[PDB]
Amino acid sequence: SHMLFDFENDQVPSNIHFLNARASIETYTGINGEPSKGLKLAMQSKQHSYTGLAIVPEQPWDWSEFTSASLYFDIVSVGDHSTQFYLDVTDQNGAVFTRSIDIPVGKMQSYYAKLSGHDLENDLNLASGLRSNPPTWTSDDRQFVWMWGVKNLDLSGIAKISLSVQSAMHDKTVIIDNIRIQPNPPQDENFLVGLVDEFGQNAKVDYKGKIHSLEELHAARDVELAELDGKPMPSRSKFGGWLAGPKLKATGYFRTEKINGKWMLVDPEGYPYFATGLDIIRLSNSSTMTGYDYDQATVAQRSADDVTPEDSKGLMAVSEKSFATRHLASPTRAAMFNWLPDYDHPLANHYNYRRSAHSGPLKRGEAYSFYSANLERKYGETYPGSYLDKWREVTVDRMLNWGFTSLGNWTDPAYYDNNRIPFFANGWVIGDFKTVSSGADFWGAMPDVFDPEFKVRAMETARVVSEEIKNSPWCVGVFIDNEKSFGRPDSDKAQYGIPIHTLGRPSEGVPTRQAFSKLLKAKYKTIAALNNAWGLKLSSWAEFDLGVDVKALPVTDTLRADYSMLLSAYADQYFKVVHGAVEHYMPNHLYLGARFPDWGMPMEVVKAAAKYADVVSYNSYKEGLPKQKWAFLAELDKPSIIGEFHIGAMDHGSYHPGLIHAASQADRGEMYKDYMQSVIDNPYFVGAHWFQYMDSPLTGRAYDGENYNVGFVDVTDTPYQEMVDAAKEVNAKIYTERLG
Ligand SMILES: OC[C@H]1O[C@@H](O)[C@H](O)[C@@H](O[C@@H]2O[C@H]3CO[C@@H]([C@@H]2O)[C@@H]3O)[C@H]1O
Numbered sequence: 001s002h003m004l005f006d007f008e009n010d011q012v013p014s015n016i017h018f019l020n021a022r023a024s025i026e027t028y029t030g031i032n033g034e035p036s037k038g039l040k041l042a043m044q045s046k047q048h049s050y051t052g053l054a055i056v057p058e059q060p061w062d063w064s065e066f067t068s069a070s071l072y073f074d075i076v077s078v079g080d081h082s083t084q085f086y087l088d089v090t091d092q093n094g095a096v097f098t099r100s101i102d103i104p105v106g107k108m109q110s111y112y113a114k115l116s117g118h119d120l121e122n123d124l125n126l127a128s129g130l131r132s133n134p135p136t137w138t139s140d141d142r143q144f145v146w147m148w149g150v151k152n153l154d155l156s157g158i159a160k161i162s163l164s165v166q167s168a169m170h171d172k173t174v175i176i177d178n179i180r181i182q183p184n185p186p187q188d189e190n191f192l193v194g195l196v197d198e199f200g201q202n203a204k205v206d207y208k209g210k211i212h213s214l215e216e217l218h219a220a221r222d223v224e225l226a227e228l229d230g231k232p233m234p235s236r237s238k239f240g241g242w243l244a245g246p247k248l249k250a251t252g253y254f255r256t257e258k259i260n261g262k263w264m265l266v267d268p269e270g271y272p273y274f275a276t277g278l279d280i281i282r283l284s285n286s287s288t289m290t291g292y293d294y295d296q297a298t299v300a301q302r303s304a305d306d307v308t309p310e311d312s313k314g315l316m317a318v319s320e321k322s323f324a325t326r327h328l329a330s331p332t333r334a335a336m337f338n339w340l341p342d343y344d345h346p347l348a349n350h351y352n353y354r355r356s357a358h359s360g361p362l363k364r365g366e367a368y369s370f371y372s373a374n375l376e377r378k379y380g381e382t383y384p385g386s387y388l389d390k391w392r393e394v395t396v397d398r399m400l401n402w403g404f405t406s407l408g409n410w411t412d413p414a415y416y417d418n419n420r421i422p423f424f425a426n427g428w429v430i431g432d433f434k435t436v437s438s439g440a441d442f443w444g445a446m447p448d449v450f451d452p453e454f455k456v457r458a459m460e461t462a463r464v465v466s467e468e469i470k471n472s473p474w475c476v477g478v479f480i481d482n483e484k485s486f487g488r489p490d491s492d493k494a495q496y497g498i499p500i501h502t503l504g505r506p507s508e509g510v511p512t513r514q515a516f517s518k519l520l521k522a523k524y525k526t527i528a529a530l531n532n533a534w535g536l537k538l539s540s541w542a543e544f545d546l547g548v549d550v551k552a553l554p555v556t557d558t559l560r561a562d563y564s565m566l567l568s569a570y571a572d573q574y575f576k577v578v579h580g581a582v583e584h585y586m587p588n589h590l591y592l593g594a595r596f597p598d599w600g601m602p603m604e605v606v607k608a609a610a611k612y613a614d615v616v617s618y619n620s621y622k623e624g625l626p627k628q629k630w631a632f633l634a635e636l637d638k639p640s641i642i643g644e645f646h647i648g649a650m651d652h653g654s655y656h657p658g659l660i661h662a663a664s665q666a667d668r669g670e671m672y673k674d675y676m677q678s679v680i681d682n683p684y685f686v687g688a689h690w691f692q693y694m695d696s697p698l699t700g701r702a703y704d705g706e707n708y709n710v711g712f713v714d715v716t717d718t719p720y721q722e723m724v725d726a727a728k729e730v731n732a733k734i735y736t737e738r739l740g
């Protein structure tokens with residue numbers, strides 16, 4: 001194709017810029033086995049949470065002739081750690097896409113990111129409904145995995161090519177060579193055909209541990225069941241705390257306390273407690289859209305009062321009447337599957353049906369859970385559905401064997417009386433209340449928390465959670481909601497997106513806007529004072545109260561101060577209402593906040609949670625908890641919990657490793673241990689939960705197409721032994737590390 005950088009002139013090129021990284025040209029051994037010159041990039045990524053290089057041509061490259069082509073890099077890690085690279089490609093209009101992949105130590109390989117062609121011809125997926133696809137051609141090269149952003153850049157002007165390492169726990173070093181563009185090979189018209197075998201596995205790729213028959217599955221089951229004796233790790237108290245104490249005052253419920261400078265939970269009997277475990281201990285998210293649909297008059301409709309969003313509903317039992325009306329809605333989906341059972345087949349009962357979807361080519365449709373089918377294959381039936389009871393018992397035996405102290409978030413309520421391991425409960429506050437927007441809402445619109453109907457719904461949410469947990473001492477506490485779009489950290493406008501978007505609306509029929517207006521009047525009194533403040537020329541408060549377009553205003557210190565007031569009042573009201581509901585129906589139990597992702601934790605909102613929540617919860621998909629990124633915790637002095645993290649890999653058939661990437665199954669375990677060490681060393685954290693128990697389906701979970709290697713078990717319900725070992729290493733030292 002077209003060689004951009006081969007480094008053979010021994011220069012570090014002046015249009016490649018470095019950020020917290022040292023670059024030089026070094027002879028190394030390339031893919032063709034010959035010594036060659038490459039760019040050695042030693043990133044100072046232990047110290048700095050963003051490191052990397054950026055190629056910035058003096059004028060954007062005009063690549064418009066490349067109508068079907070990819071960008072290639074030869075890359076390899078050097079030293080002790082694999083490197084997850086983020087590739088960010090930015091065009092001359094500011095449009096960006098992000099791909100990512102693991103870069104192992106050892107053998108150099110070629111990595112490519114498509115610029116145009118093939119499968120590039122709130123939907124983070126490719127057309128298929130997979131977050132990232134199998135390759136559209138066969139080669140030994142590795143495809144950069146799709147993450148997010150604009151599929152089709154303006155190729156007549158590529159402005160920036162960025163490779164970065166972010167929030168690492170270690171210095172990372174790579175060698176890079178042969179940066180080039182190549183036309184795409186012809187597209188394999190079968191690239192999405194026959195992806196899945198009868199077990200839910202990658203049909204086209206054999207890999208270590210793959211199941212090739214029913215008897216191998218039974219052999220896997222027999223080996224494991226032989227080792228599970230139901231026994232907890234040593235010195236765990238009844239409720240999974242630390243028997244060696246010091247023993248503290250016992251209240252009969254889980255609670256928080258600072259134990260010699262380190263925040264802890266304290267179990268119902270008074271023993272120090274630290275929460276470890278897995279999220280999604282349920283079957284709801286294990287189904288994948290098959291491509292078929294049913295007659296709508298055969299489908300039960302959602303009640304408007306239901307507290308449970310569609311994504312979190314139990315797998316729906318599909319009726320024979322429904323199945324009789326089966327028709328093809330997506331040929332592309334349907335051709336993915338080598339095996340799906342007839343309605344007559346004993347495994348037909350693992351069909352599901354979703355009535356909505358966040359992302360993907362179908363808004364609704366038939367889905368099949370291969371994991372669930374494999375439970376039945378593994379454990380059989382001694383009575384209808386007995387494989388589900390057996391799954392739960394095995395699941396609990398596993399967690400105790402593996403040393404986990406809890407069942408994490410989104411545990412099926414059938415586990416809530418297990419009375420062998422504590423669990424975390426959850427509810428979602430959903431309904432018909434009025435909404436507001438941040439201007440970039442990810443999962444859905446934000447609630448208008450000043451609408452009385454929002455409180456009516458928070459109350460019903462808590463009521464139902466309360467009826468599920470039956471005031472049990474086994475419930476560590478209650479998460480409410482998840483990853484709400486309180487505002488992105490990219491810029492002041494993004495962060496204050498809720499105030500900005502809401503200010504643009506009228507006060508009439510917008511209760512959050514009325515609350516905001518009240519605060520600004522009390523601050524400024526007259527319209528002329530507000531005019532001076534905001535640089536506006538409004539004729540009256542009445543005019544102000546019709547809505548003002550402040551999106552257009554650059555954010556000044558005055559504007560920032562006013563937006564901060566408004567966002568604080570919004571978050572205060574949210575947490576106040578949710579906390580009041582939880583305390584009303586579950587007065588004994590901890591309220592665990594709203595699970596802030598890195599893209600939705602503006603400090604005004606964190607502060608509001610620290611006021612009402614007993615434990616502030618954050619989701620953090622990174623290689624660990626970097627010092628500077630989490631220094632703000634000292635200010636709040638609140639016990640905190642990681643609700644989600646994970647590390648995935650692509651050596652066990654998955655097309656997508658997940659959010660954070662390892663070189664292999666063993667490397668996943670090593671990265672789990674590094675992540676958990678950073679939680680364990682942090683004095684504000686009282687636990688961390690891994691998302692999630694099982695891999696997502698190879699062809700994408702029905703809700704939004706995530707198709708990640710993020711399980712402790714694969715589609716066949718076989719544990720990843722490298723993850724088991726890493727969890728046991730961690731779980732053996734959680735208490736000795738925190739207490740001494
Ligand atoms: O295009 C939107 C993206 O923006 C990126 O900046 C986020 O890191 C991404 O974060 C992801 O968002 C949700 C889907 O995967 C998880 C990840 O944090 C969240 O659940 C995503 O929000």
Ligand SMILES: [Ca+2]
Nearest residue numbers: 006036037177
């Ligand atoms: Ca070279």
